[PDB]
């Protein structure tokens, strides 16, 4: 699903916090090149909330279905999938429109 050319437009919503180029800086959140199909807590130089280290332990990977649930409500996601009731997420920003979600994902699949 998903027009990755509409997804690149949508992604402009993420750019205050994230960069998308390979080797790019960790501005507020981690750089997201390579995120697709990679583990949770994928960037070794970023200090993630413990909750993302615990999805990583459980072997969660960023599939199209897990990105879709996550970007809709990051905080509910990391509670659910970590199984840690005191789970925190520094993200918080949500996408609420389904077309937007599917399009953003289609563009994250182009970045490795
Ligand atoms: C716009 C639609 C986006 C998208 C596609 C992503 N975010 Fe963020 N994000 C932020 C923070 C501070 C983090 C780390 C959270 C913490 O450790 O508690 C993240 C993390 C991500 C991920 C997970 C990457 C991983 O390696 O597990 C993903 C897939 C992701 N984001 C996608 C901060 C921000 C924002 C700051 C206000 C904004 C806006 C976004 N993120 C927007 C998006």
UniProtKB/Swiss-Prot annotation:
Binds 1 heme c group covalently per subunit. This is Cytochrome c2. Cytochrome c2 is found mainly in purple, non-sulfur, photosynthetic bacteria where it functions as the electron donor to the oxidized bacteriochlorophyll in the photophosphorylation pathway. However, it may also have a role in the respiratory chain and is found in some non-photosynthetic bacteria. The keyword Iron applies. Keywords: Electron transport, Heme, Iron, Metal-binding, Photosynthesis, Transport. The gene is cycA. Gene3D superfamilies: Cytochrome c-like domain. One of its GO terms (biological process) is photosynthesis. The keyword Chaperone does not apply. Belongs to the cytochrome c family. It comes from Rhodospirillum rubrum. One of its GO terms (molecular function) is electron transfer activity.
């Amino acid at each position: 699903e998903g027009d990755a050319a509409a997804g690149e437009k949508v992604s402009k919503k993420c750019l205050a916090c994230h960069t998308f180029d390979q080797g790019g800086a960790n501005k507020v959140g981690p750089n997201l090149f390579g995120v697709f199909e990679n583990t949770a807590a994928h960037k070794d130089n970023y200090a993630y909330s413990e909750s993302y280290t615990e999805m990583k332990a459980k072997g969660l990977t960023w599939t199209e279905a897990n990105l879709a649930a996550y970007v809709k409500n990051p905080k509910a996601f990391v509670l659910e999938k970590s199984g840690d009731p005191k789970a925190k997420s520094k993200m918080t920003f949500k996408l609420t429109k389904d077309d937007e979600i599917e399009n953003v994902i289609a563009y994250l699949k182009t970045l490795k």
